[PDB]
Amino acid sequence: LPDPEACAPVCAHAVHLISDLRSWNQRYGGVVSDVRLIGIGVFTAFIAPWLGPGQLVLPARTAAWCCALDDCADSKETSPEEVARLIDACRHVLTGEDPDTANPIACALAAVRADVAERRLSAAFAHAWNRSLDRVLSATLFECQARHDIAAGLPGPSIEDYLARSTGSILVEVFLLNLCVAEARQNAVSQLKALAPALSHAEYAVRLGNDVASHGDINVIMLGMAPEEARRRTADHARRCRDELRPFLDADPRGCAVMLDRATRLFVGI
Amino acid sequence: LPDPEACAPVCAHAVHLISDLRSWNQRYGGVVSDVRLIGIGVFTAFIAPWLGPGQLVLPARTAAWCCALDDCADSKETSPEEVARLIDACRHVLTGEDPDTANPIACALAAVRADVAERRLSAAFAHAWNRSLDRVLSATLFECQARHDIAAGLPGPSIEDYLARSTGSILVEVFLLNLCVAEARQNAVSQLKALAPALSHAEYAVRLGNDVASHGDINVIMLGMAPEEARRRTADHARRCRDELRPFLDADPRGCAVMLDRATRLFVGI
């Protein structure tokens, strides 16, 4: 059973974070569904239990922002063309421009980006942050297009292309990059680069595992993969991620690799 | 650090429970503050991590209901006479009557009581449930009266009387009784009786610990106890509770005693 003493402050972090996210959300129009806000608050705290609540704010809001984008693009009335225009406006926000749209998703992005900038980290971290969000934007448009295509009688993407392109919306990288910087600040970029092979396996495991569980939604099972095969591959990727992490976990029990190991084990374990 | 595998389903329980409580709350007018709802959802799940989300609903709603009562009685504009009338109406609800008031606190009580009754447990469990809530009602009126008395220039209660009478609003018993019945059903009453000595120490530890931390509120430090003495006594009671629990914890690692041990360690650890 989880140790009560180890859990107690982690539970308390979660309560503060869930409350923060409700306020931030209402500040930006109610862009994210409440149940996702709750999940982000709980899981952020359990990924990195040694961080203070103040260090968890950025990561949690950045993840919440990604969930809004996903909700908006999951509308039945919006076209891939409409989603692409929203995506474009967000990419312009990432370069530092003010939103060229009244869509509150773009406003919320500019707010969270400003929060990052306030801590004046290197060209390199700001770059890495933008890139991670550009992956989420690309993956979102990919999934939207795929849903539109299937509903228009097209075959939709191949299974391997789906896995390669939809892993960008899995968020693990967003949690990792944003939490790692609190702990490692200036060294986070290099640590993140080193974890790329493990991170790729963690992403595939969580995508596969999520898809098996959910089985409008496009998923790997409706594309033709058998549930037992999606379960097999989830486990196989999870093991490969752990094997890639072992040398880092041995060197530091409170570093970025541990955060990746915890996130993967938390998200595969649901 | 808390084990990720052990935590993962417990985190998922929490998310469902926090969401449940928001809906129930809105059903009954918004009687409890959101931040308390979040705390109840998180901590319920970590007290009894081996229970399913469906088994956690009752306990969490019963605890939420106690927090509403406390919010209502913590109004600056309501008199002890007004609070006593609310308390009286709730005691009538506990006997099975329909609320004789339009106060939504009484309505919410009747709803949760109905939820209990639906599972047709013995005269004895229903009795124990009512008694635990009567303690919370009595303690609430005591604290309200004490606040009124201090603000009217009276000395307020002695420290030992404050501790004896305000422990009823601590909730540990509410979480314990309600969670224990899910696991032990028919045997819960006798198990609860056996844990009375430990429970008394757990209550005193959490009251002392809560009061130290909060330092309108009446608390033991403003009544004259030094912070270091309140901290000493918190630790001493916590140890005594553990010594009383040891024989039960040795006999069963998934029973009601473990729930009391976890609740005490969680609530003292914040």
Side-chain angles (χ1 to χ4, degrees), chain A residues 164 205 224 240:
Chain A
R240 288 177 185 261

Side-chain angles (χ1 to χ4, degrees), chain A residues 137-147 157 161-162 165-166:
Chain A
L137 290 163
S138 289
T140 297
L141 181 49
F142 169 78
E143 303 176 297
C144 178
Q145 190 62 64
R147 293 189 303 271
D161 285 342
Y162 169 77
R165 310 270 300 290
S166 74

Side-chain angles (χ1 to χ4, degrees), chain B:
Chain B
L1 300 183
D3 184 79
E5 322 286 0
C7 292
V10 185
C11 290
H13 300 350
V15 170
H16 166 99
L17 209 46
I18 296 165
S19 182
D20 181 77
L21 294 173
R22 285 182 46 76
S23 292
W24 173 92
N25 192 33
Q26 290 163 170
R27 284 223 277 303
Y28 295 86
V31 292
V32 50
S33 174
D34 197 68
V35 73
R36 290 168 90 175
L37 283 187
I38 303 164
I40 298 286
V42 178
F43 280 89
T44 302
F46 281 83
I47 292 166
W50 65 94
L51 305 180
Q55 298 180 294
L56 303 168
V57 181
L58 162 81
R61 287 173 185 185
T62 305
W65 176 79
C66 297
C67 294
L69 172 68
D70 186 34
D71 166 272
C72 182
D74 269 318
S75 163
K76 273 194 145 86
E77 288 176 33
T78 73
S79 63
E81 184 188 318
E82 287 154 334
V83 172
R85 295 189 322 257
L86 176 61
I87 282 168
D88 185 82
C90 294
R91 293 187 200 286
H92 283 284
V93 171
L94 301 177
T95 72
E97 295 168 54
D98 285 317
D100 194 19
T101 175
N103 195 306
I105 298 320
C107 186
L109 186 56
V112 191
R113 183 182 174 282
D115 294 331
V116 168
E118 264 155 56
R119 308 150 171 135
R120 319 183 316 288
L121 295 174
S122 50
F125 176 77
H127 188 247
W129 192 87
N130 290 339
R131 286 288 191 209
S132 78
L133 298 189
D134 208 72
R135 278 186 79 217
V136 172
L137 290 163
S138 289
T140 297
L141 181 49
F142 169 78
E143 303 176 297
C144 178
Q145 190 62 64
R147 293 189 303 271
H148 180 277
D149 286 355
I150 292 154
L154 299 174
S158 73
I159 281 170
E160 293 298 321
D161 285 342
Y162 169 77
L163 295 174
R165 310 270 300 290
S166 74
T167 39
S169 72
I170 264 323
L171 304 208
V172 175
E173 181 175 51
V174 173
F175 282 110
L176 180 60
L177 175 156
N178 288 275
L179 291 165
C180 182
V181 77
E183 173 81 343
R185 276 259 178 153
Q186 297 285 188
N187 306 302
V189 173
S190 65
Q191 296 182 32
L192 296 169
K193 287 180 177 165
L195 294 177
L199 176 59
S200 182
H201 286 295
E203 293 176 333
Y204 272 70
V206 176
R207 163 52 67 220
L208 284 154
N210 287 2
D211 283 12
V212 154
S214 85
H215 181 64
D217 187 54
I218 170 169
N219 71 64
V220 85
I221 308 311
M222 62 90 90
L223 298 175
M225 186 172 292
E228 58 269 11
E229 174 61 5
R231 280 195 281 270
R232 186 190 72 78
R233 296 183 190 207
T234 301
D236 200 273
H237 285 290
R239 293 191 199 99
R240 288 177 185 261
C241 170
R242 185 36 159 278
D243 294 349
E244 297 271 12
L245 292 181
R246 186 67 203 270
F248 293 97
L249 297 179
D250 291 341
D252 185 353
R254 294 292 181 287
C256 303
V258 162
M259 300 175 193
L260 178 56
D261 185 63
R262 294 180 63 80
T264 304
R265 293 160 69 180
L266 293 156
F267 295 151
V268 174
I270 301 319

